[PDB]
Symmetry: D2
Subunit: 140 residues, 4 copies
């Protein structure tokens, strides 16, 4: 789809209609400890001053960290939802791509924590996100 | 378009083409110490599991806090960009609207800080965002 | 003690020997939704440049938010521990007192969230802390 | 005293009288991109439930990241103070040492950002702190 982990036969919202598909997020790699994703910059990713929207970096980090957790825990009967997202912005991006790498740093019974680095086409660190993902028994 | 502050005669990217116009953010009240905005929930705002995307709350807080700062500082020769966005998620929203209220709590010379509450249609506090906005002289 | 909630007959560490008692934190008010505490500035609260240590504000917020949660949940068989502490620093404090007010904004089954405001003797907002407190069944 | 960088001929407050000297923080390595420090756990570091206080991890990260910045910028006429400290807690520490490693990830002209890991004696990641340090010209 955007290559999200295939863990269920039906999803409530089709990729192309979600925020993820609308702005164009695509997952490249995914393992239990490390996942990567990326997006082309288009105006849909921008704010009116022409820079990538701060919310775009937050949303990229959120889907990558959450879905990399879903990829492990869904078959174990658990759901995984974002609980906290702290993104800090170091350098703006005006065009090209934004590439995210999520590295898992803690995997607890109720919380997984991911460090996400957001880089521009020159490899420069433009933002980071500390993602905290709540993991709970799936409700009937 | 989304009732963002009119502080310039032209902008790099038109409202309807930005992330904010694409998902449908609209500013209601705007003062130097407080601002509100809301968005109707549609699939464009959701992730594939059918909930409002964590990134959408981050983005709504981000735009509102930044533009509320812009409204004040632009005519003083400053720009205002997000430097830190920490959003915590308390309850999911499945449909209706998300309504954001931003309250200014510190206005320094280099950093303004806003507390943003994001509520659902029943008035419940579903997410909060602590927004730090860097204020710097405009380069042109 | 520092007037911490009296919820158990024995505690592993006496007040006066903990970090709290060593720097002098004292709780003034406590209810399920709102708690206050304060400390005299002494060198023990300072760093070597003579300002209150950033860690002092974090530690004040942490004990106040956590113990205001303990005050409700301990008798229900639960423990409460800090899970995240985000403190932002707006104005330094060189002497006098630091006064903290914690307002509960969410009380979930597994997480309570407290906004803490840290004010100087003139009432000025010097720092804030967003405290996330994990609440778990007490282990035998 | 705690092996903090020697960048001035005198300081307002002596090491042994500061928070850092009182709880016993000691800097081991210090470079412009990386620094380490450690502390022996004693009751002075703990809270009443017998665990290292959340505030102590915050303070150790705070001092290390700030002073690591100080080591570089002081001789350039700048001061460096904590602007934001976000510490997340993964595992409690009851005794032994806490060992902090600070890695610089962004060095802007107004803000330096450090990732701090806090590990226990077995090497386990017990807490992390994202430290944003404001760099500003010294007023004298
Ligand atoms: C926050 C949380 C409970 C969340 O759990 P998680 O992310 O699902 O991690 P998980 O549940 O897999 O457990 C990790 C470790 O946490 C501990 N833990 C987790 N749940 C429990 C529990 N129900 N009972 C006892 N220990 C637990 C235990 O050490 C566990 O390891 P293990 O024995 O299971 O191998 C766990 O990450 C944690 O315990 N983190 C540390 C909390 C901490 O140390 N905070 C700072 C101290 S408490 C706050 C404070 O400063 C304070 C100061 C003054 C004052 O008067 C009161 C409070
Ligand atoms: C971070 C910042 C500098 C950013 O400024 P801002 O948000 O734009 O606010 P603004 O610049 O308008 O100034 C607000 C107040 O900050 C102070 N300030 C700002 N710039 C300066 C400066 N260049 N020189 C001295 N003070 C300044 C000043 O008190 C100012 O009030 P005023 O005298 O200008 O009315 C300001 O918010 C601030 O100073 N916050 C407090 C920082 C703080 O106290 N952090 C904790 C202590 S430092 C870190 C630490 O714990 C540590 C521990 C051990 C150790 O060995 C080393 C460090
Ligand atoms: C995070 C947490 C589960 C923690 O729970 P808590 O602080 O203990 O709160 P509590 O458990 O009392 O429940 C509050 C509400 O959360 C929901 N909830 C809590 N636990 C569960 C559960 N096990 N199953 C279903 N719903 C639950 C439920 O709505 C609950 O209300 P109620 O039905 O019990 O009245 C709860 O606060 C929460 O659900 N918060 C919202 C999480 C959220 O909406 N995050 C953003 C969306 S998920 C992340 C994301 O953006 C994403 C994007 C793309 C993608 O592909 C994947 C993910
Ligand atoms: C926040 C800050 C200005 C602080 O500076 P710093 O950490 O000291 O780094 P420094 O000042 O060294 O500059 C780093 C880069 O930032 C940019 N920058 C810094 N100061 C300026 C300035 N005065 N004017 C223009 N660009 C600047 C510049 O690109 C710089 O690289 P260089 O050209 O100087 O090599 C810089 O880190 C930065 O720009 N970060 C990125 C900010 C960002 O992109 N936030 C997200 C977008 S803005 C918020 C938003 O989403 C929004 C959405 C809707 C809406 O309607 C309004 C806003």
């Amino acid at each position: 789809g955007g290559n999200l982990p295939d863990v269920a036969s039906h999803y409530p919202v089709a990729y192309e209609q979600t925020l993820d598909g609308t702005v164009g997020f695509v997952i490249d790699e995914m393992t239990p400890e490390r996942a990567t994703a990326s997006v082309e910059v288009t105006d849909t990713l921008r704010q009116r001053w022409g820079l990538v929207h701060g919310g775009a970096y937050c949303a990229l980090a959120e889907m990558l960290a959450a879905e990399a957790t879903v990829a492990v825990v869904h078959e174990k009967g658990m759901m995984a939802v974002g609980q906290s997202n702290h993104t800090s912005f170091f350098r703006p991006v005006k065009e090209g791509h934004v590439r995210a790498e999520a590295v898992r740093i803690h995997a607890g019974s109720t919380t997984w924590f991911w460090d996400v680095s957001l880089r521009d086409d020159a490899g420069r660190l433009c933002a980071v996100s500390s993602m905290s993902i709540a993991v709970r028994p799936r409700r009937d």
